[PDB]
Design a binder for this molecule. Structure first.
Ligand SMILES: [Mg+2]
Ligand SMILES: [Mg+2]
Length: 255
């Protein structure tokens, strides 16, 4: 194939690329997702309702405060085939190294991983513009579409933040309720692999183990989302004989 496996999206081609995605989603209704963001800059203080509560209050504090940098969406059909048009889309969001908050370590990691911060400052997408398109796209609010993620608390929180444009709910129970309306059918591969199957490996280590090859750069959301899709179908085949167990629906790792 002579076209790009990873389609990059900027403010200049947002509408075109969303139009392409909208035209494909009915035929390729399995969406795998990842996000990149500027890390964690703080831990909230006090003592907490649990341990997951502490995890949720950490997430909420940082996701509310730190701007999204990339979202990766990889479409597949129900047997794992990607559209020939694109193995994955990578949405690149507006960010300003001089003005915005971030963990310096994360910016360095993203830079080494290939993020063009100057270009994100110049033609990065506004999350709000993306969110209007995403909500009307057919990908969310639809039981017909399955979302696939990995260790997904922050990743899903960033998408909910984009769509709602307001601070996240104060308690996990409320976050979970609203999340399951926008993403009514989702699987977290980390929950499946570690919490159910007692395999603690990370995304890349699972792919290496299963001999699944990565296309694109590690630690970029497009490539990470595509690897997520490929691991999902291989796990479904190897440990679920083709049919994922319904007890794993909508369970997020660590929350
Ligand atoms: Mg992720
Ligand atoms: Mg990633």
């Amino acid at each position: 194939s002579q076209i790009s496996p990873i389609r990059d999206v900027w403010s200049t081609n947002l509408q075109q690329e969303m139009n392409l995605i909208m035209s494909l989603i009915e035929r390729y209704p399995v969406v795998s997702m990842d996000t990149e963001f500027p890390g964690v800059v703080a831990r909230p203080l006090g003592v907490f309702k649990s341990s997951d509560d502490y995890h949720y209050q950490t997430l909420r504090a940082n996701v509310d405060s730190l701007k999204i940098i990339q979202i990766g969406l990889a479409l597949s059909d129900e047997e794992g085939n990607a559209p020939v048009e694109a193995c994955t889309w990578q949405f690149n969001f507006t960010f300003n190294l001089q003005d915005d908050m971030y963990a310096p370590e994360s910016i360095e990691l993203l830079t080494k991983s290939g993020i063009d911060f100057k270009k994100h400052q110049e033609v990065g997408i506004e999350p709000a513009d993306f969110a209007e398109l995403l909500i009307g796209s057919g990908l969310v609010l639809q039981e017909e579409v399955t979302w696939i993620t990995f260790h997904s608390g922050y990743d899903f929180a960033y998408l909910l933040k984009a769509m709602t444009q307001i601070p996240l709910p104060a308690e996990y129970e409320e976050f979970y309720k609203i999340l399951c309306i926008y993403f009514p059918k989702n699987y977290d591969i980390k929950y499946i692999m570690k919490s159910v199957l007692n395999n603690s490996k990370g995304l890349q280590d699972i792919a290496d183990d299963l001999q699944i090859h990565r296309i694109g750069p590690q630690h970029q959301a497009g490539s990470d989302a595509l690897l997520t899709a490929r691991i999902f179908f291989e796990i479904r085949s190897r440990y679920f004989d083709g049919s994922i167990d319904s007890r794993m629906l909508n369970q997020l790792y660590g929350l």
